[PDB]
């Protein structure tokens, strides 16, 4: 579908710009896409508001989450070598999606010599 | 008072509480604070019970008992959306306060309310629920008795 390509190209654009988080947020009038490229939030695209439900649905099925359940928070995973952690949550104008993009010695980690 | 509140709500992290009795206009003060912060450079999200009105540009989740979506679970969900500032309706119990204290220490600016008669009553109230006396000193930026 056209929506499947849009989410895939958006993820490619997120890796292009060096984004850590992708923020899909639905308001009453507008739908907004934002990346947090290096800790700074950024406007990237404001598509048609009608697409809200389809973008939420596509990102759910990629992370193997419930499509029809729009009343509780759902957290899932995807492997594209980019490991993403999607997190959906209920709101006033539908769900709000955020997917954190993470790339895939014991002493260096923290342990002392003893 | 505005300039002092401005600087406090514009800090990168910490808890700011607004206290007083019922019908003291706490929400109105919080809503005014969020609207002042409402910029394109920050991600602001809220958990409310119920949502008083809609701020355009700010995310606002409602406490839904039909799906067991509580303040604690709602606040725990908001923290996974990569927020800069968070506004909790009110911290009624220990579990919700524990998450708000962790939120404040972990780089988020937290905002909430408590039904206490004095500004010291808010610091008081956090000590009562079971927040370690220390954790209040590190996280708390200020209290607004209104």
UniProtKB/Swiss-Prot annotation, chain B:
Signal peptide: none annotated. Disruption phenotype: Deletion mutants show complete loss of protease secretion. It comes from the Bacteria. Coiled coil: none annotated. Forms homooligomers; most probably hexamers. Interacts with EpsL/GspL. Belongs to the GSP E family. This is Type II secretion system ATPase E. It comes from Vibrio cholerae serotype O1 (strain ATCC 39315 / El Tor Inaba N16961).
